[PDB]
Amino acid sequence: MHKIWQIFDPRRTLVALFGFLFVLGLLIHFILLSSPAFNWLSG
Amino acid sequence: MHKIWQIFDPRRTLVALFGFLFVLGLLIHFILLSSPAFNWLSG
Amino acid sequence: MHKIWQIFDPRRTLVALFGFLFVLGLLIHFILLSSPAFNWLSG
Amino acid sequence: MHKIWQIFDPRRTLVALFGFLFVLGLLIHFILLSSPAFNWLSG
Amino acid sequence: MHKIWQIFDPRRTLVALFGFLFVLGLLIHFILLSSPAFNWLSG
Amino acid sequence: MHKIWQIFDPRRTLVALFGFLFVLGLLIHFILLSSPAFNWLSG
Amino acid sequence: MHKIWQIFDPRRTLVALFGFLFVLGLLIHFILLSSPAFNWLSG
Amino acid sequence: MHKIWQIFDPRRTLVALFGFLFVLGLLIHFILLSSPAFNWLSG
Amino acid sequence: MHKIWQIFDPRRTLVALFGFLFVLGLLIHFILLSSPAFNWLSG
Amino acid sequence: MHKIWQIFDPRRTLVALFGFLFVLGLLIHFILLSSPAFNWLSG
Amino acid sequence: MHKIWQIFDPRRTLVALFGFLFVLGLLIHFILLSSPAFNWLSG
Amino acid sequence: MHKIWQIFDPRRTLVALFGFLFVLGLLIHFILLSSPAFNWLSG
Amino acid sequence: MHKIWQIFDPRRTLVALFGFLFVLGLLIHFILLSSPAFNWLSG
Amino acid sequence: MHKIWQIFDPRRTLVALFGFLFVLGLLIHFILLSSPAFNWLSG
Amino acid sequence: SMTGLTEQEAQEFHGIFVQSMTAFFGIVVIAHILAWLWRPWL
Amino acid sequence: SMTGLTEQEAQEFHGIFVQSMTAFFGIVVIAHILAWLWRPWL
Amino acid sequence: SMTGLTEQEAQEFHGIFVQSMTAFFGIVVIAHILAWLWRPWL
Amino acid sequence: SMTGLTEQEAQEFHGIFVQSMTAFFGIVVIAHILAWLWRPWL
Amino acid sequence: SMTGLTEQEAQEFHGIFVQSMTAFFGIVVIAHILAWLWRPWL
Amino acid sequence: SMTGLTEQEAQEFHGIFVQSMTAFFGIVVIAHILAWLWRPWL
Amino acid sequence: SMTGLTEQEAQEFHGIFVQSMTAFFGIVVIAHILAWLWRPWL
Amino acid sequence: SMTGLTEQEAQEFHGIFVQSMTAFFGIVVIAHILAWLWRPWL
Amino acid sequence: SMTGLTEQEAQEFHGIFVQSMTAFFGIVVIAHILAWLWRPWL
Amino acid sequence: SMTGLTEQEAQEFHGIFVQSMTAFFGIVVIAHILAWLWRPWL
Amino acid sequence: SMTGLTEQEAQEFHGIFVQSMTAFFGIVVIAHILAWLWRPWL
Amino acid sequence: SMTGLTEQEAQEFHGIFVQSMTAFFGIVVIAHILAWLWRPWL
Amino acid sequence: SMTGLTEQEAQEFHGIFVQSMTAFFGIVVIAHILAWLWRPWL
Amino acid sequence: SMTGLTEQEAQEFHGIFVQSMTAFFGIVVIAHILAWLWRPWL
């Protein structure tokens, strides 16, 4: 399974993964803010 | 059936597949959020 | 009938066919969601 | 009548024909969906 | 009258002619759909 | 009067003439459709 | 007065003249259609 | 006074003059159409 | 005072002067038309 | 004070100065037209 | 774990990290200002 | 203090200064016109 | 800690730092002006 | 502290400083004009 | 003469072009007769 | 003279052009007569 | 003539093209008979 | 003199230009007379 | 002939293509039968 | 002097230019007299 | 054959691809069973 | 000096320029006198 | 094989990648347990 | 010094520039006096 | 290995990076404790 | 030093610049005194 | 090491940078104390 | 160092820069005192 690094660049795979993870966290936090039942900043 | 990897580049097929799967999962999760019967963040 | 593959590029055909089939599936699923009689996510 | 293939390229002609036929089928199906008397997805 | 083929390219003439004929057919069919007296998809 | 063909190209002239004639016919037909007294598709 | 053809190209002048005359005729016919007193396609 | 033709090109000047005269005539005719007291196409 | 013609091109200057004078005359005639007290085409 | 003409181009300065003076005169005349107390074209 | 500095440029990584941290702090401070319960500049 | 002319071009500086001063005067005059208490063109 | 200056340029870093500090000060001052409780220019 | 001039160009730094100072003065003056309590051109 | 076709290639293309256009016009005429029996427009 | 056609090619093109234009104008005249009998506009 | 296909490569392509188009048209005809049985439009 | 035509090619073009323009103006005059008999505008 | 594949590479690709298309169509047919048992649309 | 025309070519163009402009202005004057008899604007 | 992979590199990639896809599909199936236990949609 | 005109070509252009500008200003003055006779604005 | 890393560099990167991803997933799991004790969503 | 003019071309341009500016300012002053007699703004 | 840093330069950078990040996180933790004592959000 | 002007050309430009700026500021001060006499703003 | 500065130029820049940043932070702290005595926000 | 100025050109510019900035700040302070006597904002 390590052979994926012979196919994918350790750096661009890693930068892209970090960027997508950050955008995903932002999106999930924003979605929970848009839901009144899970908005923790109201109250 | 393995001969597909002699026609399709493994890295570009993996990148495109992963991106399409991520966008598909985002789309399905967003469609269920727009569905009042299947929105799990209301209540 | 196999001679079409001496006319059509296998990889570009396969990529285009898969993309059009995916877009067709998305379109049909979205059309059925827009029809109240066939929306399975309401109820 | 076969001489048209000495004038028309088989691959570009055939790709254009398939694309136009697909778009025509999509258009005809969308028109019948816009007509209440022939919309099969309501009811 | 055949000498028009020494002036007009047999293939760009048939491609343009076929495209214009298809667009004309689409236009005439759409104009009859927009006319209530000649819309065949209502009723 | 034939000398015009030594000034104007038999093909480009002819293509332009056919195009303007087609657009003129389209325009006149659309104008008669926009006039209630001469719309033949109403009734 | 003929020497204008040694200043102005017979063909480009002639194409421009024909185009301007056609556009002028279209403009005058459209102005008369926009005037109720001279619209001949009403009634 | 003829020396202006040694300063100005007889053809570019002449084309520009004809174009400006045509645009001026169009403008003056349009202005008289926009004035009800001088619109000759109403009545 | 003639030495301005050794600084300014007799033709580019002259074309610019004629164009600016024409635009100025158009502007003044349009301003007087926009003033009801000085519109000569109403009445 | 004449040495400014060894810094500033006599012709480009004159062109710019004339253009700015013309635009300034236009602006001042338009401002006085927009002021009812100083509009000379009303009445 | 230090080997990441042989994959990721110590400077571009560091600039990107500082920029993302600054934008994240701005975003969090703006979200709390938009939340009435945690807006500290009101009252 | 004269050494600034060895750092700043006597002419590009001077043109920029004149332009900014003109724009500043225009701005201040327009601001005083927008203020009813200091508009001198009303009355 | 000084070795950061062997990674980051004394001048570009410093220009960016000054620019972001100025924009941050402007932003904080504008936010306090948008807050009625901390607007010092009202009253 | 003078060594900043071996890092920052005396003229481009000075031009930028003057421009930012002018824009800052304009901004502060406009902000005080938009505040009724500190508008000096009303009354 | 202008495109590259000879007088025999142009004559060969013209015959097939005219036959195809005649077939197209015959189908069009049959469709128009059917449409007139369906809904006359004049 | 200006495009490349000789006068024999221009005269032989002019005849076909005039014949085609005359056929077109005759068809237009018949159509306009039919339109006038259908709905006069003057 | 213009593309590169000979008369044998064009006749080989034409036969398969006509067979495929005939199969497509047969499926189309069956579908349209079914559609008329479902909802006639004329 | 400026575009390349001689005095004989320009006089040959000028005659045909004037004849065509005169025919155009005659047709225009007949049309305008018919329009005046139809709907006078002055 | 036009892309580069021989008749053995085109027949090897065609067999796998047809098998994959048949499997896809079988899954599609099962899904459509299930959909008809769920909600008939005709 | 600046474009390329000599004074004989400029005097030849100037004469025809002045004649054409005089004819244009005469037609304009006649039209404006007719317009004044139609609808005076002052 | 077309990209550069041999039949042994393609079989090496295909096995790992199929294992990863099977693990992904197993996780997906478990998630969908849990979703049906939570809120059935049919 | 800066464009290419000598002092004799500049004095030749300046005289005609001044004459043309004076004629233009005379026409303008007559028009403005007529306008003031028609509608004074002061 | 395709990027440039050998199997020893890929196994060295894979181990650290898996350790970092496992730590990230452990923190994520702890956070999700805390969120469930805070506000269950199912 | 910077644009190419000497002190004699710059003094010759400066004199005419100052004379023209003085004439312009005199005309402007007369116009502004007339405007003040027409409508004082202060 | 990929950027240019050796393992001594990377370990020199990693130590300072970890120290700076730890100081940043300590300041952040103190700020968050102060925020919780100010306005708890859970 | 940076643009090209020597110290004597910079002192020559500086004197005229300061004289012009002083004249401008004197006119500005007179205008602002007049404006204060017209409408004080403080 | 990376941008061009030696360790003596980087230590020379670091001292002045830290002194300037400390002065800036001290002025900021005094301003924030003044703001808190003017309008506390917590 | 990097722009091109020596320690003597940078010290020459720094002294004049500091003097000009001090004059600017003194004028600013006087203006702000006047503004506070006009309308205090705190």
Ligand code: BCL
């Ligand atoms: C308004 C009341 C009438 C009506 C009366 C009018 C009248 C009156 C006329 C038409 C004309 C036309 N009408 Mg109609 N028309 C009606 C309604 C329609 C409807 C419809 C769906 O209702 C259709 C599609 C048409 C279509 C047409 C075309 C057959 C024709 C214009 C073609 C053209 O522009 O060629 C011009 C472009 C070309 C390129 C022609 C070139 C000719 C050369 C020699 C041949 C080369 C082949 C060339 C590419 C195509 C030739 C086409 C034929 C010449 C038509 N009519 C109704 C019911 N119509 C006109 C006609 O008969 O023209 C022949 C005409 O005079």
Ligand code: BCL
């Ligand atoms: C309106 C009432 C009916 C209905 C009656 C009609 C009628 C009537 C017809 C269709 C036809 C079609 N309908 Mg329908 N249709 C309905 C609702 C649907 C719905 C839906 C969401 O409910 C969808 C997904 C479809 C889909 C389809 C396709 C199977 C087909 C059009 C394919 C095409 O354009 O090929 C054209 C494009 C090509 C590229 C074809 C090329 C053929 C060559 C030989 C093969 C090469 C492979 C090629 C790439 C793809 C081949 C696809 C098959 C030929 C279908 N129908 C309903 C309920 N429908 C038509 C059909 O049967 O066509 C075969 C047809 O005649």
Ligand code: BCL
């Ligand atoms: C409308 C009422 C029904 C429903 C009935 C229908 C019917 C009827 C069908 C589907 C079909 C599908 N439905 Mg559905 N479907 C419903 C709701 C859903 C929802 C949801 C959020 O609820 C999801 C995401 C899906 C998803 C899907 C996919 C599994 C499938 C379309 C795949 C495709 O386009 O391949 C096309 C694109 C490709 C690239 C295929 C290529 C195939 C080759 C041989 C394999 C190569 C791998 C390739 C890259 C991906 C293969 C994917 C699989 C073939 C699925 N359905 C509901 C509840 N749905 C269809 C299906 O079964 O297709 C297999 C089908 O016939």
Ligand code: BCL
């Ligand atoms: C407003 C009340 C009047 C009226 C009174 C006015 C008055 C008054 C005048 C016109 C003028 C014109 N009117 Mg009118 N006009 C009316 C309504 C019309 C209507 C309409 C739809 O009813 C149209 C089509 C016109 C059209 C015309 C043109 C014949 C002419 C402007 C030509 C031009 O600008 O050349 C300018 C451009 C050129 C290139 C001219 C160049 C001349 C050289 C010497 C010849 C070279 C050939 C050149 C390419 C074209 C020459 C055209 C002729 C000179 C006309 N009038 C009504 C009913 N009209 C004017 C005229 O007579 O001009 C001669 C004129 O003085």
Ligand code: BCL
């Ligand atoms: C407002 C009440 C009055 C009126 C009073 C005013 C007054 C007062 C004046 C005009 C002027 C003009 N008016 Mg007026 N005017 C009225 C309504 C009209 C209407 C209309 C539709 O009713 C028209 C089209 C005109 C037209 C004109 C032009 C003849 C002239 C501006 C030309 C110009 O800008 O040259 C400037 C541009 C040039 C290029 C000039 C260059 C000159 C050189 C030497 C010659 C080279 C040829 C050049 C290309 C064209 C020369 C044109 C002539 C100089 C006219 N007036 C009414 C009824 N009008 C002015 C005039 O007489 O100017 C001569 C003038 O003083």
Ligand code: BCL
């Ligand atoms: C919704 C109710 C809860 C809440 C419950 C959830 C749950 C449940 C989770 C979070 C997660 C996070 N929450 Mg939360 N969260 C809340 C409110 C907040 C608020 C706020 C303004 O109130 C903010 C600032 C955050 C911030 C965070 C981050 C610490 C973290 C997402 C980081 C990420 O996406 O890394 C992804 C991007 C990367 C680049 C990670 C890479 C990791 C590698 C190994 C390290 C390299 C350094 C890298 C650049 C940064 C690492 C960051 C850490 C891994 C966090 N939460 C509230 C009150 N939140 C998640 C978490 O714990 O992630 C660890 C998580 O599981």
Ligand code: BCL
């Ligand atoms: C507001 C109440 C008054 C009025 C009072 C004012 C006052 C007060 C003044 C004007 C000035 C002007 N007015 Mg006024 N004005 C009124 C209404 C008008 C109307 C109109 C439609 O009613 C017109 C078109 C004008 C037009 C003019 C111009 C004659 C002149 C501005 C020219 C300019 O900008 O040169 C600037 C641009 C240049 C290029 C000048 C360059 C000068 C050099 C030396 C000569 C080179 C030739 C150059 C290319 C053009 C020279 C033009 C002349 C200098 C005018 N006024 C009314 C009724 N007006 C001003 C003036 O007299 O300026 C001379 C002036 O002081």
Ligand code: BCL
């Ligand atoms: C608000 C109540 C007052 C009023 C009080 C104010 C006050 C107070 C002042 C002005 C000033 C000005 N006002 Mg004011 N002003 C009023 C209404 C007007 C109206 C109008 C339509 O009513 C006009 C057009 C003006 C016009 C002017 C200009 C003369 C001058 C700004 C010039 C400038 O920006 O140079 C800046 C740009 C330059 C390039 C200057 C450069 C100077 C060098 C030395 C010379 C080189 C020549 C250069 C290219 C042009 C020089 C122009 C002169 C210096 C004016 N005022 C009214 C009625 N106004 C100011 C002034 O006097 O400045 C001299 C001034 O202090």
Ligand code: BCL
């Ligand atoms: C909100 C209630 C208070 C108020 C309390 C706050 C508080 C609290 C603070 C400020 C700060 C500032 N306030 Mg405040 N402030 C108020 C209203 C104002 C108004 C106004 C129109 O009323 C003005 C124009 C200002 C302006 C300022 C600046 C003096 C300063 C931010 C400068 C900066 O961003 O440097 C950052 C950008 C740089 C480039 C600095 C670089 C420093 C280096 C060492 C020097 C190089 C020169 C550099 C180019 C410019 C240096 C500028 C000085 C450091 C200020 N305040 C009111 C009435 N304000 C802050 C401050 O004191 O900062 C010093 C601060 O802490």
Ligand SMILES: COC(C)(C)C\C=C/C(C)=C/C=C/C(C)=C/C=C/C(C)=C/C=C/C=C(C)/C=C/C=C(C)/C=C/C=C(C)/C=C/CC(C)(C)OC
């Ligand atoms: C090179 O030549 C050789 C040697 C080969 C010989 C061959 C020669 C040949 C073949 C020559 C052929 C010549 C031809 C065909 C000439 C045709 C000439 C034509 C038809 C001339 C027509 C002229 C018409 C003119 C100029 C009309 C002008 C109309 C105007 C300007 C109208 C203006 C209207 C205005 C501005 C305002 C009012 C209109 C409204 C009211 C609409 O505005 C709102």
